[PDB]
Design a protein around this ligand. Structure first.
Ligand code: NAG
Ligand code: NAG
Ligand code: CA
Length: 276
């Protein structure tokens, strides 16, 4: 029948930092068109909260909305008569699922107690969850109150990808992250023979096998008497230094040849004895 006011939106809810504008149409012939913050102050223009007034509409733009922004805004018109209609819009500022400062290739040592870390958060407290394939909860895996999952005896097969999924049932909002898990495993030397034997002056020869086990794969360095063993014409090592061949053994070559195997998770050393 008579004067009335409308707004582009009625109920909006945006993340923090998000921006948006609303338009207030005043169907009629208003002399007055004014906005009001949820505090009841007649909005004045600021380059972050801007108010543009044209014709019979009025646009209110909120840039990078913070938390002091939520509330019931009101556009309110007034003609030459005392008639004074208004429309209102409800703004809700919230927090998207954030995953701040969350490193991946997370490394852990074979035996230790691992805690895979996922720093995730949202306005209504997120509902986090850990997946491997697919869910997980096997009396060795458990989610701490801080959202991280722990693995008590992080065996190396445990090594893999883990999804830290998070949902906000209040918004049907979901988002995950995929973390890589690395199981560092100290070196484990393996050499079937640690006691060899050739004949002196005769141009005999002997190869010495030393294999290891670890993640990363261990580096095998040999030592003799007190010096690192280099190749030379005397010794020839091939299989990434897993096979030490001593050429032209005399009497002086008899005795321990020590085998070192190293990685970032420790070291193992075993030696062979060469009898002449
Ligand atoms: C050569 O040395 C090994 C050391 O394990 C020993 O068992 C073996 O008896 C030796 N060979 C001979 C023919 O004695
Ligand atoms: C689990 O698998 C890894 C594979 O590298 C191995 O290191 C570990 O010994 C295994 N543990 C069990 C329970 O068999
Ligand atoms: Ca923006």
């Amino acid at each position: 029948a008579l004067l009335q006011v409308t707004i582009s939106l009625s109920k909006v809810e945006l993340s923090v930092g998000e921006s948006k504008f609303f338009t207030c149409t005043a169907i009629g012939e208003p002399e007055s068109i004014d906005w009001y913050n949820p505090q009841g102050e007649k909005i004045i223009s600021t380059q972050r909260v801007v108010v543009q007034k044209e014709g019979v509409r009025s646009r209110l733009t909120i840039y990078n909305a913070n938390i002091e922004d939520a509330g019931i805004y009101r556009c309110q018109a007034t003609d030459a008569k005392g008639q004074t209609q208004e429309a209102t819009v409800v703004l809700e500022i919230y927090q998207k699922l954030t995953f701040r400062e969350v490193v991946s290739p997370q490394e852990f040592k074979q035996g230790e107690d691992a805690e895979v870390v996922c720093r995730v958060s949202s306005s209504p407290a997120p509902a986090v969850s850990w997946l491997y394939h697919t869910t997980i909860s096997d009396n060795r895996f458990a989610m701490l109150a801080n959202n991280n999952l722990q693995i008590l005896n992080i065996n190396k097969s445990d090594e893999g990808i883990y999804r830290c999924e998070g949902r906000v049932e209040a918004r049907g909002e979901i988002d995950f992250r995929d973390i890589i898990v690395i199981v560092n495993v100290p070196p484990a030397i393996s050499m079937p023979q640690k006691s060899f034997n050739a004949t002196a002056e005769r141009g005999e020869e002997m190869t010495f096998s030393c294999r290891a086990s670890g993640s990363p794969e261990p580096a095998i360095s040999w030592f003799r008497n007190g010096k690192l063993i280099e190749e030379n014409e005397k010794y020839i090592l091939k299989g990434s230094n897993t096979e030490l061949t001593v050429r032209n053994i005399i009497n002086s070559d008899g005795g321990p040849y020590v085998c070192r195997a190293t990685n970032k998770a420790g070291e193992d050393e075993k030696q062979a004895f060469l009898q002449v």
